[PDB]
């Protein structure tokens, strides 16, 4: 659940979640949230797991951008900064603030605690907001499969639009095999590993605290200018998706309802979405590179290659 | 939601190939040849509706529909072991039995003359499915169905499901024989101009390379018909291994596409298989580290596809899907990715974005693997313009020469004039010229 | 008061229809095919006398007169195990063994011919029931008796019971004269029968080669599929529950009101016995997902890309260990999905029944479910028809074997008259579609 395995699931809740845009989820009781999960559950293979019934759903105070800034502007001077800041200049929240919790009973009630459960909940949201931004992104590519309707030199314009959003799309995903293949299966073996070899519950509980640091750590969480700079490029991502969605939609019915126009459905602000896409990464490869000299953090030289791996960003770095 | 596959077999290539394909899938969902459900993975954790119809008998059936314009093949799948598994209702063969004769103009002549029943067969199974994710093309860019049929199922298809992604298996006809068919060479320009302008992905699958791996490293004297099938089925195994296993992230066909296709028009992803060897090198218990995998994907020996290397023309990657399968520490693969950057084991296209990526998987648990470790490369990289450039060239000498053009004449497609075919020899042209450039630091 | 259903099995299909029911029937209450409960029987949790008459030696016999115009038959049940089930003289067979000659208008002179012995059976056994609650006719539309005399009992039945359901099972064809019998018979069905339950054989055909792997399927098989479907339309009688346990809210949830009684069936689990589907724990949402699935239906509509057909009504009775709190999950996750599309002119009838099955019939699943539909698709059926009547009136074809008959000696002004109703029917359907529909033919 929270890690996302079997994430089935969760490219099925995305298009619940997708109806709901406009306000924060915590605005609204989880008890139909719940109902429509268990109704999308039994589509799917799931019975043989009989865990899931531990799993409920908490409405945040603060969506996942904002309160993951919080977090990382406490006990430092961008508290003071970012205490005006809102969600509405950037990506708006309407389905960020969905996260899972583990609820279980004495004496596994020990091995979970609220401590834990708020890096969890942080954690589950970011996952679930960065996988739906990728499904959002992979759906508007495949919606884009009737501009092979039209002839090549009429779409120009969207050809230039559809490689921003193909660059943006690359980012996520690669952002997303790194940070799951790469840090999540790792750290689940080597927690899984400790609790295996060890036998005391103050022992485990020590090692899922540092899983946790770990896993918050590698998904950039303890450098504030990092968090920022992914927050940002994530909703610039999620912001041009949506802007694409609506005349992609549009295009599409027209294509397949008939079986200069497409110069005015490519507005202006693709260039400004692009432009913005590119300031981004490269903040986030130089801070990375910083952040790898001189705090000599493991995972941001990961991110570094990840980002310069085509001949043209590694004397960019 | 499942993100269902339909596979179009189409001639005799693309059924032969459709067939292997479902043998493989078959074993790897452990699915008797008969339709049942083998015991042994009725607890499977395997989500089989991503590519498995579920039958009234609790039985995974591939929606996968057998189109042939000659009785032959369509009637060897029928008597084959996996008669039983397939639904009767979604065979479609041409009661005219007499193909498309090695022409593309019949083939889609013939395509055009049965649209009604492959479009009814089409939307019976999109409407079976619940969240069909696109259509699978298995055909031959050389013979006259596989071409020409199979060019306008594609265009239906893509017309018919335009939010769907259209992947297709294209053999591409062998290079250095002097083809039987002496319209070969059109057969196969018509069928790269149709995954230029009709199909999201064209998977080239050379015969002629093919032959030459398992002659080189298999050692099979005149390889038959059935290995060639058994290696396609390999092919389209380890490319469906990351749906097959469940993992964080890519886990649809859509987020595959993202990954292997940067750039619309260079959306040909080429396949990469390791290890190359014959069952009798039982090659001791070699531990393969992801740097020997790794090395073993960018080898030429194991590429399936027979590119020229010119020497004139830097050739680059611009794009690398690395699928690793089986007990893989991911330590070890960000160990192997940090050891081929140092390494520059890989040149890419100067002016695209940076993708390689690498999918952890673990392998089917019915099927035995002798090696601890494998690992399956789809790479979009231009040098496949050098097998288009080799099928135009072999156009252009027919051409030139009016060679093999009688029964594109005979066709109504061509008998007032060839335009067809110089508009496919000019997306050809452009598709070699936008490789190039993709090769080039201003194909921005 | 008991509430007894007369079966008229009529031709060799209502006959053979009606053979299964009983069978099915037997095997259910653990019956021996003499009619006599078996020992294991004693403690039944269905009491015969719903469907059955009691005879004083304990003997359960089926409130069913078959009626066939061939001596093959008749003599072959006569030799059959099921013998000893029916009543000898509760069988009539015409002596003039000449038939209808697959007519309808020859079907319905006959049973003009023989309405005093049929309409003596009917009462007969109307007032050996203490409650009759209407009558189940099992014909085909297609043959001469079974379509002719089914209608004209049928009229019959209507006349003299007035107050009583009159359900059908009315076997569609996959005879020159057939547009001429589909015609009358859909007529008749749509003016003078409550509720037509429609058996598409070439939708049965379909499902059992593409489902069971049965190459060729026999008309024994289909029949045993049919008869299945029977049981399943009996379920909800066999189980004590709060609603619907009569043919009268049977026939007004499934065929959605009497005149509009065309209804489209549903079967599940459809599976050979040799598919011993693994170890899945079927679940509620499972079931209703295989209903609502087009393979799973047992009539052939034709997806018409103009008509944007819904469903009318639709009552799921749920035989077998079934999780109530799973039937209203699946019901609210269908709703909210929108799986089925209803009708935009009325109520969204989406029923579920759970019922316990019957101790002696052996349930491989441990739920299963049956679906009847009213649904506006049916229409297609009815529009295949009327193109096929057009066909033949256009060449006025198959027409001489009909001007031999009295009802067709001068004209053929009442097969018009079928025709101007079926159309009726056909757009009374296609604003069923329309939200108006509930004001279009008022």
Same mark, same amino acid.
């Given at each position: 659940?929270?890690?996302?395995?079997?994430?089935?699931?969760?490219?099925?809740?995305?298009?619940?979640?997708?109806?709901?845009?406009?306000?924060?989820?915590?605005?609204?009781?989880?008890?139909?949230?719940?109902?429509?999960?268990?109704?999308?559950?039994?589509?799917?293979?799931?019975?043989?797991?009989?865990?899931?019934?531990?799993?409920?759903?908490?409405?945040?105070?603060?969506?996942?951008? !904002?309160?993951?800034?919080?977090?990382?502007?406490?006990?430092?001077?961008?508290?003071?900064?970012?205490?005006?800041?809102?969600? !509405?200049?950037?990506?708006?929240?309407?389905?960020?603030?969905?996260?899972?919790?583990?609820?279980?009973?004495?004496?596994?009630?020990?091995?979970?605690?609220?401590?834990?459960?708020?890096?969890?909940?942080?954690?589950? #949201?970011?996952?679930?907001?960065?996988?739906?931004?990728?499904?959002?992104?992979?759906?508007?590519?495949?919606?884009?499969?009737?501009?092979?309707?039209?002839?090549?030199?009429?779409?120009?314009?969207?050809?230039?639009?559809?490689?921003?959003?193909?660059?943006?799309?690359?980012?996520?995903?690669?952002?997303?095999?790194?940070?799951?293949?790469?840090?999540?299966?790792? !750290?689940?073996?080597?927690?899984?590993?400790?609790?295996?070899?060890?036998?005391?519950?103050?022992?485990?509980?020590?090692?899922?605290?540092?899983?946790?640091?770990?896993?918050?750590?590698?998904?950039?969480? !303890?450098?504030?200018?990092?968090?920022?700079?992914?927050?940002?490029?994530?909703?610039?991502?999620?912001?041009?998706?949506?802007?694409?969605? #609506?005349?992609?939609?549009?295009?599409?019915?027209?294509?397949?309802?008939?079986?200069?126009?497409?110069?005015?459905?490519?507005?202006?602000?693709?260039?400004?979405?692009?432009?913005?896409?590119?300031?981004?990464?490269?903040?986030?490869?130089?801070?990375?590179?910083?952040?790898?000299?001189?705090?000599?953090?493991?995972?941001?030289?990961?991110?570094?290659?990840?980002?310069?791996?085509?001949?043209?960003?590694?004397?960019?770095? | 939601?499942?993100?269902?596959?339909?596979?179009?077999?189409?001639?005799?290539? =693309?059924?032969?190939?459709?067939?292997?394909?479902?043998?493989?899938?078959?074993?790897?969902?452990?699915?008797?040849?008969?339709?049942?459900?083998?015991?042994?993975?009725?607890?499977?954790?395997?989500?089989?509706?991503?590519?498995?119809?579920?039958?009234?008998?609790?039985?995974?059936?591939?929606?996968? +529909?057998?189109?042939?314009?000659?009785?032959?093949?369509?009637?060897?799948?029928?008597?084959?072991?996996?008669?039983?598994?397939?639904?009767?209702?979604?065979?479609?063969?041409?009661? &005219?039995? $007499?193909?498309?004769?090695?022409?593309?103009?019949?083939?889609?002549?013939?395509?055009?003359?049965?649209?009604?029943?492959?479009?009814?067969?089409?939307?019976?199974?999109?409407?079976?499915?619940?969240?069909?994710? =696109?259509?699978?093309?298995?055909?031959?860019?050389?013979?006259?169905?596989?071409? $020409?049929?199979?060019?306008?199922?594609?265009?239906?298809?893509?017309?018919?499901?335009?939010?769907?992604?259209?992947?297709?298996?294209?053999?591409?006809?062998?290079?250095?024989?002097?083809?039987? +068919?002496?319209?070969?060479?059109?057969?196969?320009?018509?069928?790269?101009?149709?995954?230029?302008?009709?199909?999201?992905?064209?998977?080239?699958?050379?015969?002629?390379?093919?032959?030459?791996?398992?002659?080189?490293?298999?050692?099979?004297?005149?390889?038959?018909?059935?290995?060639?099938?058994?290696?396609?089925?390999?092919?389209?195994?380890?490319?469906?291994?990351?749906?097959?296993?469940? =993992?964080?992230?890519?886990?649809?066909?859509?987020?595959?596409?993202?990954?292997?296709?940067?750039?619309?028009?260079? &959306?040909?992803?080429?396949?990469?298989?390791?290890?190359?060897?014959?069952?009798?090198?039982?090659?001791?218990?070699?531990?393969?580290?992801?740097?020997? +995998?790794?090395?073993?994907?960018?080898?030429?020996?194991?590429?399936?596809?027979?590119?020229?290397?010119?020497?004139?023309?830097?050739?680059?990657?611009?794009?690398?899907?690395?699928?690793?399968?089986?007990?893989?520490?991911?330590?070890?693969?960000?160990?192997?990715?940090?050891?081929?950057?140092?390494?520059?084991?890989?040149?890419?296209?100067?002016? =695209?974005?940076?993708?390689?990526?690498?999918?952890?998987?673990?392998?089917?648990?019915?099927?035995?693997?002798?090696?601890?470790?494998?690992?399956?490369?789809?790479?979009?990289?231009?040098?496949?313009?050098?097998?288009?450039?080799?099928?135009?060239?072999?156009?252009?000498?027919?051409?030139?020469?009016?060679?093999?053009?009688?029964?594109?004449?005979?066709?109504?497609?061509?008998?007032?004039?060839?335009?067809?075919?110089?508009?496919?020899?000019?997306? +050809?042209?452009?598709?070699?010229?936008?490789?190039?450039?993709?090769?080039?630091?201003?194909?921005?």
């Amino acid at each position: 659940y929270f890690l996302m395995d079997q994430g089935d699931f969760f490219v099925h809740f995305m298009d619940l979640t997708e109806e709901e845009l406009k306000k924060p989820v915590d605005d609204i009781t989880p008890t139909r949230l719940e109902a429509l999960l268990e109704l999308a559950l039994r589509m799917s293979t799931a019975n043989t797991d009989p865990f899931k019934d531990d799993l409920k759903i908490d409405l945040m105070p603060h969506d996942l951008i !904002t309160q993951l800034l919080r977090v990382l502007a406490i006990e430092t001077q961008q508290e003071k900064a970012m205490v005006h800041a809102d969600p !509405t200049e950037l990506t708006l929240s309407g389905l960020e603030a969905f996260s899972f919790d583990y609820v279980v009973t004495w004496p596994l009630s020990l091995i979970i605690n609220r401590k834990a459960l708020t890096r969890y909940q942080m954690l589950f #949201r970011h996952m679930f907001y960065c996988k739906h931004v990728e499904r959002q992104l992979c759906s508007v590519w495949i919606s884009n499969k009737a501009a092979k309707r039209f002839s090549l030199h009429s779409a120009k314009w969207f050809a230039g639009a559809f490689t921003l959003r193909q660059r943006m799309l690359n980012f996520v995903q690669n952002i997303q095999s790194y940070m799951m293949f790469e840090v999540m299966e790792p !750290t689940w073996h080597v927690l899984e590993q400790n609790l295996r070899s060890a036998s005391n519950i103050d022992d485990v509980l020590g090692h899922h605290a540092s899983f946790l640091d770990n896993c918050l750590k590698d998904c950039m969480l !303890t450098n504030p200018e990092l968090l920022r700079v992914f927050s940002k490029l994530m909703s610039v991502c999620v912001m041009f998706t949506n802007c694409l969605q #609506r005349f992609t939609q549009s295009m599409k019915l027209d294509s397949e309802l008939g079986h200069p126009q497409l110069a005015s459905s490519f507005e202006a602000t693709i260039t400004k979405f692009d432009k913005n896409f590119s300031a981004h990464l490269l903040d986030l490869l130089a801070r990375l590179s910083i952040y790898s000299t001189s705090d000599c953090e493991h995972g941001m030289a990961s991110v570094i290659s990840r980002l310069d791996f085509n001949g043209f960003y590694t004397e960019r770095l | 939601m499942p993100r269902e596959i339909i596979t179009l077999q189409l001639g005799q290539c =693309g059924n032969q190939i459709g067939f292997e394909f479902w043998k493989q899938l078959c074993a790897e969902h452990g699915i008797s040849p008969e339709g049942i459900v083998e015991e042994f993975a009725t607890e499977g954790t395997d989500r089989k509706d991503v590519f498995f119809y579920q039958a009234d008998d609790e039985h995974y059936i591939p929606r996968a +529909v057998l189109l042939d314009l000659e009785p032959r093949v369509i009637h060897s799948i029928l008597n084959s072991p996996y008669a039983k598994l397939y639904n009767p209702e979604n065979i479609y063969l041409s009661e &005219h039995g $007499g193909g498309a004769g090695n022409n593309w103009a019949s083939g889609f002549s013939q395509g055009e003359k049965i649209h009604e029943d492959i479009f009814d067969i089409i939307d019976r199974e999109a409407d079976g499915s619940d969240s069909l994710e =696109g259509f699978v093309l298995c055909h031959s860019i050389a013979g006259g169905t596989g071409s $020409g049929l199979g060019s306008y199922l594609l265009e239906r298809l893509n017309d018919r499901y335009p939010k769907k992604l259209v992947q297709t298996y294209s053999v591409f006809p062998n290079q250095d024989e002097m083809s039987d +068919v002496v319209v070969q060479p059109y057969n196969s320009l018509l069928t790269l101009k149709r995954l230029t302008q009709n199909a999201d992905c064209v998977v080239v699958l050379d015969n002629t390379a093919l032959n030459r791996i398992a002659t080189d490293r298999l050692h099979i004297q005149n390889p038959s018909f059935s290995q060639i099938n058994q290696l396609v089925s390999t092919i389209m195994s380890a490319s469906t291994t990351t749906l097959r296993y469940p =993992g964080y992230m890519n886990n649809d066909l859509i987020g595959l596409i993202a990954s292997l296709i940067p750039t619309p028009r260079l &959306h040909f992803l080429m396949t990469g298989y390791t290890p190359l060897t014959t069952d009798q090198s039982v090659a001791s218990v070699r531990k393969t580290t992801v740097l020997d +995998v790794m090395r073993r994907l960018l080898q030429p020996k194991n590429v399936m596809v027979s590119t020229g290397r010119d020497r004139q023309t830097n050739h680059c990657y611009i794009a690398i899907l690395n699928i690793i399968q089986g007990e893989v520490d991911p330590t070890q693969v960000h160990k192997s990715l940090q050891r081929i950057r140092e390494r520059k084991l890989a040149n890419f296209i100067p002016w =695209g974005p940076a993708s390689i990526q690498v999918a952890l998987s673990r392998k089917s648990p019915y099927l035995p693997s002798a090696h601890r470790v494998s690992g399956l490369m789809m790479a979009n990289h231009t040098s496949i313009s050098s097998l288009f450039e080799s099928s135009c060239q072999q156009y252009d000498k027919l051409r030139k020469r009016e060679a093999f053009l009688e029964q594109f004449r005979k066709e109504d497609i061509f008998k007032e004039n060839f335009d067809e075919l110089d508009r496919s020899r000019e997306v +050809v042209q452009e598709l070699i010229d936008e490789y190039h450039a993709a090769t080039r630091p201003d194909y921005i």
